[PDB]
Design an enzyme around this catalytic site. Sequence first.
Site, short mmCIF file in Angstrom:
data_model
loop_
_atom_site.label_atom_id
_atom_site.label_comp_id
_atom_site.label_asym_id
_atom_site.label_seq_id
_atom_site.Cartn_x
_atom_site.Cartn_y
_atom_site.Cartn_z
N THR D 1 -4.84 -4.36 -4.35
CA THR D 1 -4.56 -4.40 -2.92
C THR D 1 -4.42 -5.83 -2.43
OG1 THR D 1 -5.73 -2.33 -2.47
CG2 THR D 1 -5.35 -3.82 -0.61
N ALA D 49 -7.96 4.18 2.46
CA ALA D 49 -6.70 4.76 2.89
C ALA D 49 -6.88 5.57 4.17
CB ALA D 49 -6.13 5.64 1.78
#
Lengths: 204, 228, 213, 201, 240, 250, 239, 215, 238
Positions: D1, D49
């Site tokens: 990420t 998420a």
Amino acid sequence: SIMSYNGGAVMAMKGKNCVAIAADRRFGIQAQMVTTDFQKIFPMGDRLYIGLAGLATDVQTVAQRLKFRLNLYELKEGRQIKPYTLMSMVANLLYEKRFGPYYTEPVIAGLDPKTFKPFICSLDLIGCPMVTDDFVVSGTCAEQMYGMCESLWEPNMDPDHLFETISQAMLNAVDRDAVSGMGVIVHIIEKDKITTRTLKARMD
Amino acid sequence: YDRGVNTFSPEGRLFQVEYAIEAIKLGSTAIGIQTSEGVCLAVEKRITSPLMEPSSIEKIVEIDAHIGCAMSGLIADAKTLIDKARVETQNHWFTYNETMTVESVTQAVSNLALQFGEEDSRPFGVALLFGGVDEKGPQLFHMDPSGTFVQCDARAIGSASEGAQSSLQEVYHKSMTLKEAIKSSLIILKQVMEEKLNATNIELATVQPGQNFHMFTKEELEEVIKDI
Amino acid sequence: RFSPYVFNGGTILAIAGEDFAIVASDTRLSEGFSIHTRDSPKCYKLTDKTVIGCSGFHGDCLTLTKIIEARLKMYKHSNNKAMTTGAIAAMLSTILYSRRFFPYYVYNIIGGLDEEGKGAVYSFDPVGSYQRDSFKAGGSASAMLQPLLDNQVGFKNMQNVEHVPLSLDRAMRLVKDVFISAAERDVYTGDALRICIVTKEGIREETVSLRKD
Amino acid sequence: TTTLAFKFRHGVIVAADSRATAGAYIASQTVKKVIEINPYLLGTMAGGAADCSFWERLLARQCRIYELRNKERISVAAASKLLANMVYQYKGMGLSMGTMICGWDKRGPGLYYVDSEGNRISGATFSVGSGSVYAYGVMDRGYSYDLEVEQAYDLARRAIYQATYRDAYSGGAVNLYHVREDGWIRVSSDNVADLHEKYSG
Amino acid sequence: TGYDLSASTFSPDGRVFQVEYAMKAVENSSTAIGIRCKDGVVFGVEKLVLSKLYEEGSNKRLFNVDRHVGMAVAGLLADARSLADIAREEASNFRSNFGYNIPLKHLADRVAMYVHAYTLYSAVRPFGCSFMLGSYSVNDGAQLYMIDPSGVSYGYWGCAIGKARQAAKTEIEKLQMKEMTCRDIVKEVAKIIYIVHDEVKDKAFELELSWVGELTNGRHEIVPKDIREEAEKYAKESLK
Amino acid sequence: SRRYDSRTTIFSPEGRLYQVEYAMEAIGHAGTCLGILANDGVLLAAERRNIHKLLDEVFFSEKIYKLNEDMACSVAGITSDANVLTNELRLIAQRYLLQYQEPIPCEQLVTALCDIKQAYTQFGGKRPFGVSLLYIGWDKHYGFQLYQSDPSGNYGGWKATCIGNNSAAAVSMLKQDYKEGEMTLKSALALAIKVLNKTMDVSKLSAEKVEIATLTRENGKTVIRVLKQKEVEQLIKKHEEEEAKAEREK
Amino acid sequence: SYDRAITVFSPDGHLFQVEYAQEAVKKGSTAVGVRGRDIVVLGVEKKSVAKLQDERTVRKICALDDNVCMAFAGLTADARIVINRARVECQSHRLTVEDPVTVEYITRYIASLKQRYTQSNGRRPFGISALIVGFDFDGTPRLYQTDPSGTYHAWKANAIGRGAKSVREFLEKNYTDEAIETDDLTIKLVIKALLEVVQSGGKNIELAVMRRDQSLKILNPEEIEKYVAEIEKEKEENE
Amino acid sequence: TQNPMVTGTSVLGVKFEGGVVIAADMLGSYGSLARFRNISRIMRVNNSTMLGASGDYADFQYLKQVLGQMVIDEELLGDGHSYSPRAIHSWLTRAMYSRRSKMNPLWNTMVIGGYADGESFLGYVDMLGVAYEAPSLATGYGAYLAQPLLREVLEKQPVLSQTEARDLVERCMRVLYYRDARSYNRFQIATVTEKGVEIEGPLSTETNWDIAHMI
Amino acid sequence: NQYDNDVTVWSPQGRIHQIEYAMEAVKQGSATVGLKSKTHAVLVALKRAQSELAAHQKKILHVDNHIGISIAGLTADARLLCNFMRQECLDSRFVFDRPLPVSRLVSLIGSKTQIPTQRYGRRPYGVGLLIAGYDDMGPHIFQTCPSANYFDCRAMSIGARSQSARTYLERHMSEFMECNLNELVKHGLRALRETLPAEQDLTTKNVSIGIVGKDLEFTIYDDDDVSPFLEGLEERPQ
């Protein structure tokens, strides 16, 4: 301890016709001091003081709350307050936080409003009163002030020897203590007048 | 107090709801017309003073990107209904990624068109015309204070609605076009109003499926008026 | 003490085609080192164009299935039309976040047709995100199945291999091969296979056995 | 990420990767991380998420409510403020959220940085994620205010390539969005291996 | 005239006219009687078909509250349904809190207190119901109670609720009620209902008979009245 | 249930208000108070209701209420209806002092009590506090002050106030005998002696039927002087010597 | 609460108490307000000072923000409540949104509060009507009015209170765009409108302005005296 | 319940042709002490379905009370409609799940057996809400011990007779008496058909110990 | 006439007239007819409109997979009890995982509508329910009332001028029990064509038909599977 987070020491001593209360001046974090003019002895009416020791948060909070309830009492009734009444009020105020407790050991010292009879008492962090005749102490250092006052007290004391006795006791018991020091303020009150003296304590 | 909020009639319906249906009549008129090309909509502002700024008075508000509106009589209760209806359509977008269709919008309004209650507050004093473009094409929808919600092809409300409905039934059919219905509406408007028709009296609101955005005409309406 | 979760295992597959969505799942329900049954299909037929699969903790699967069915009936009985696929996906994401701070221990895969009439596989996570992907394998045997689908469906990591659109019976032989090959090495997979196919003409089901251990 | 954002003379650049792992296991390769809030807002996915997706959807709902009530488009600082106030009400309960907010303002460019720890701050450059430090390094090499357009494109693309080259938790397709005065515009979606062939020499 | 409006106010002569008006509401209702034998309690309600629109088996006023207790209501039907639901709830609380069958005295007293609480205040009206309560137990025998709209609840051998309240009990009390088993009492209630109002004001009626006792082994159900068919073959012999 | 409803907060059939006007006409039949224009200090005057001889007068205060330390208030109207208001007023001022550890600047105190009264003017449907009452006090921002609450919730900052039908002629004497510049409290006390000499029906102004309290600024204290009776007696003797001076025109 | 319907409709379709609570506004003090292009101006009449007391607490014009100004008529207590809540609301708007407060937002709050206050169970409607003047977005002058119904309604000039029809009739011969739009001439023309009042004593005039960047300026009744003198001078030049 | 005080032990149930037989024993052990050696661990629900359970016996008394009240209520509706066994299974699953969602679980392990309308039914309800259907159920240690005998013979023979089912249950309970430490030589067999519900008496086992004569 | 104002007041003749006023408010709805065969239950209602251009106010609305209701009177109380009806259906569909028997649902409706008929502060519900359903024992045709005294019939008809409909139901209730769907539905509209004055005829757009069957799911029809239902008729006997 949590009582030794900000230090603190309050001594009160009953004399013959008068009463003497003294405390330290130091304010600071665990090992770092900040100032020497932190107030721990508060005026609650005339010829009657209170001393507060422990966490400074609870000192100022309980002092303002007690001043709140004190003025509400002194405005509902025009007279001034008797010390036993104040003791019961402080007991009720501390005991309302039975499980949310303040970290303080209030000491009440005052004269009679009608006569010149003195009064001393002290409380614990949950509201346990304790009336004596010679002296009460509070704060971090205890055994020092107990040893000094059980060494130096006489029953019938003129206010000068009262002042010198509480002076020597506070100076030596503070100089033996580590986290509480940096000056001493002394309130010696009586029927006629109110005296406030500051001593030349060791700044070490 | 001559039979307040909670009593029927000896012969008929409730008093207060009937009095609300009477209460609509003092409001200013409005005419919306469903056409398969799209929904058009018009209203009269009833401006009193030249100080009374024309573009601040709201009659058509913006519910969604493709849903118009028209109100009647009382203004602020209608604004409250508009606000909460917007919130509930936005809740539909929240939980559905999509557009709450216009019938479901007005059902969400008329679930509490009559939930008036002071114990266990009053009924509302506004008739609302809703127009929008769902997946079934355009829609024109008419509700009332009583919650009696119905689909109308070209509904006229409020003041002078009798002659408006009659002369509208004279000209209307199923295969209308857009601009013909627009001028056929504003003819009826300048037959039901009291002043001369100019740029500041009326306002139009037209929505098309390909022109979902901008449910308004801004000062081309002057050119539309001068075509009669 | 009492632990609120237990791992029941399971394996759910989905494949998005040009005009079809195949969802298959084993019907083994186990616990620890035992077998409770050999018939418990993870698939559920919601509408004529929507099949949902739910693996993980079984009681949450049953509860979630019944709540989704209730809300399907609420949308139908409120708005005179069925939901789309993405609306059901969004609603399930709202539900899985609506119990964020006491999560479902459930993997979820929704396959079905969109409003254009094409295949769409919406994956999930235990906490409530989703995305429109072409193929997913959920459960214990996820890692035993994802690289082979990367090799065959995606044609990934290959050279001079053109892209043919995935037909139907080719996808069927793919599903049979991947479930046999995954049932060879997994402990939470076997004893049956319930294959659900969503076309433009209804829902088909199919029962193919496996090895009995 | 690994995500980044930086504003300059010609608007705002937003780029991100598309890998979203689960522990040591990669779930997907094409996770669209830059969540498209509005035709004038772009939100990202930075840690978690579901939390980022849900709260940005709720913020988009709230912004649409604000616009439909005032007939005037929301500012950037207002959106970041609403997001921080809504996130602050679950502090300590275990929300991980480090998203970024980009958009155009009445003032012009607007770039704020909102954490689940609530560190709502303005600024000019930001980068979130595990391998964000790599992007900080090569970006603060190549950063200026007076850059061109294709120069900024090359800066962001090279930055995400270096970040995914060093970090293990980052990869997949490199998205690239560009915020203008009128609205944001997707530039390109570039794979890592294509950048390796193109930029390896 | 001035004091019959509210249910809280008193009168210049000291009574509540609301309770009186609710008592004479049940006067227009259907005739419902009940009687017990030495090993059971038998109910019976004169029930009427409207004209030709009924189905002979709907909306039966003979309810069945507990396993051994049922009601024999007459008056407004929906109010009796709600009160029956309250009685089911109270028997539910007793079975849930003590593990055995509710004694009928305590049940009737709780129901009387519930009716009294709806008679006290001004927000609510008095009930428009008057009902019967029968039971049987192996250590208690047969118990038949009676609740007015006011809330006065005490016990009977026989009772009647409806138009012919006096005109049933004129010849109810001449029954040798102790020495009979209830299987005689079935056709006894049949002849009592069949005596009153054959054809005079209305056209047709229809009979229901409830049934609890030792012969049901402690159960409460409607008789299989078609079995032994005891009304009509004696009703046609009771017109002369 | 809906035929026992009084009007309570409902407008008239002619455009006026009901409980407000009837509260004012409840005010007008009560004791008369006033304060004076004085800079270095401020005073209050009050008339004894129920002057029957078999009372005790052991309360030291019948109209004054020494509310915080540097503020008192006179009152007129229903008594315990106002005693509840004095309790709430002191409690509001004391929680203010609890909040800031600085005394209350007296106008937000007046707005606090006025909004308490107003909350029963709009909703609640109860009897409104039909009591007007005075204010004396001192601050850091304006000095000595005077305020007048009303049942409507309106307050005027006055320099010479008004109580009801017994005091309309008093306010007429206040305007026809307007003073400015002379802050000497004794002149203002002679003025108040003159005002209650005309307005009250107490023949020759017996001192048992009056009450005067003042509020001066002393070094840092702002003491409230609820004065004794002997100085009232010699003030009346001074005023009747001024009546002899008034009939030096004969 | 009290479960009763303070709001009931008429048999012919009216609200008995809202239109009628406008009468309490109609029987209050007068106050006007106009917008110039850069300076906004308003003021109230009828201070009605008994010439020997204070008046600094009875001020009917106050502010909520550094951008916005108030006015009202009717009775003053409902204005006091609405102003207290409006201060709270403008500051709570300042809490989240970091803008200077738009006039349209605070008027929507006041009108929304007024309508949901009139709607509810047993609460007397606020018998006021406010004037909300401010200039925020690029210094664009705006002024809105209220109603006991709760209808914010944007104007360019305004007249409320006693005899507002007469005041608007003077405003009729005052609706020229030129009127030369000077600061002194527009302010003095507003002063002339307040001079067209039922009494026009000359000393009870109280006016306050804002030049769209500054704060509130309370005037001094000598500049107004020279304004009245030059108004009388222009009236003599008519002859 | 976090800590089960008085637990039962394994419950066996199996369908046959037009009926379901369930048998569980009668022991109320607390810890290791077999304190309550005469208790009933099968409720004969009204006329079709039938319940047997494991785990904490007090919770079983509680659910006995609640289910008894619900069955009494529907039987007092007088509509001629009863609960199907699958409806009871659904209600019980929802009840256990709503218990454990509030972090207050009912420590049980329940078996529902019923025969209604031609079709047999044999349902399972766990503490955690895991619930399914099966042609043969086995709880506690029975799923470890007597389950493979059930799954052996049902694979060996898909249909059954009533006698074969009862004999197989007898053999499995004998085996559970052989090597469960929490077991006891007293059990009762309960059987449903279309003829009603029948509870047999406290049967026992016939044991063998001829391996003990070896060293 | 001063006791005839509120729900709480009993009359001095014992007839609470607020209930009668709600009944007469039900009598001013649209006409509707419900009747069952042994295997199929059909309820047919009548639509009306405010004007020519507007659509017709619908009466037959969906509830559940085997339950559908007709209506007459008010529409706010109709949709209120509709929302309560769907809620109570899906509650037991959730809990017991079975379709509901009809009798307990109508008992819950009566127990729901009891409270607005006894305390002070609510009106009786102007409502005209005709409920069709399927338990294990076949079709059921129930009706309600604002007094919550629900009835079971074999053929009812409520609304405006519905008494001639009742005469038709009397003289064909013997014929109703045997037939299949088609002539049953045309008996239903051979009641509805007498719920109208004789100088006009029932067209397509104003009528609505809802069939539920023992194997057939509940389905509403409008004009297009009603054009098959409207043919198969003769004229009125002029």
